[PDB]
Amino acid sequence: IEIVLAVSSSVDRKDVVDIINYINEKGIDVWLWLDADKVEEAIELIEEAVKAGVKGIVLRTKKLKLEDIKKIIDILNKYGVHLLIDTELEEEEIRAIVDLAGPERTTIGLKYDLGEKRERLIRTAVELGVRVLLTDVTDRAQAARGLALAGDRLELLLDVDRTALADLRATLALAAKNPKVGLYLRVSRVDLAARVRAVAAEVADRLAFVLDAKNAAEAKALIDALL
């Protein structure tokens, strides 16, 4: 399996390092999903995460525009940072970022709870070959619709603690049937996180788990639940 640490740029850089160290001590790939809330501290985290042995880094661009990313593109490239655009910008801005970084280092990210604005971004991303990530997914109907609109560019962020058993099994089956689809399992509850492992081993299954690094202690025990 792989563990993704989703943090803001302002997380105490110490705690992320121990979590990265703890995960690497178990011989497991660890990724960093970093919110670019402040650029200077984001770069400091990127350097710290790289030195701690992170497998890779995804930068959630947040409110950063094209000009902001331009000033740090050399730093992003030298550290191999993947860009996740928050879809608060217009198609002109998203196309500019995709053209700047390349379609294969860029992902369109949006909560499924959007309406027609959700569908507008998927079509543009599909044309550009950019992967599109649907977050806050809880029902199989949402996953099936995302597969219909996005095809093999689809990525799903599944809210495990808010997903019923039937939807969890169906979404896992959909991912197994469509292996090019990226499936990410956001987990906080220890019992439910262990539950996915048992269900996934019967229905599917690599597994990517998305964790918060708010407190180191619960994150360790959460990592141990996923083994």
Fold of 2-225: TIM Barrel (3.20.20)
Residue spans of the domains in the chain: they are: 2-225
Going by C-beta distance under 8 Å and a sequence separation of 6 or more, which residues neighbour residue 84? 33, 58, 59, 60, 61, 106, 107, 109, 133
* Residue 224 to residues 25, 80, 193, 203, 220, Cα–Cα distance (Å): 12, 29, 10, 22, 6
**Interatomic CA distance for residues 121 and 171, integer angstroms:** 22
Final resolution, Å: 2.3
Q: Distance between CA atoms of 226 and 88, rounded to whole angstroms?
A: 33
Q: What is the DSSP letter of 105?
A: G
Q: What are phi and psi of 30, to 5 degrees?
A: -125, 130
Helix (H) or strand (E) holding 80: none
CA dihedral 54, 143, 133, 90 (to 10 degrees): -170
End-to-end CA distance of the chain: 9
To 10 degrees, what angle do helices 190-203 and 216-225 make?
30
Q: What are phi and psi of 195, to 5 degrees?
A: -65, -40
Q: CA dist 92 to 23, 52, 80, 87, 173, Å?
A: 39, 36, 24, 11, 36
Distance of alpha carbon 142 from the chain centroid? 17
Rounded to whole angstroms, the Cα distance separating 215 from 65 reads 31
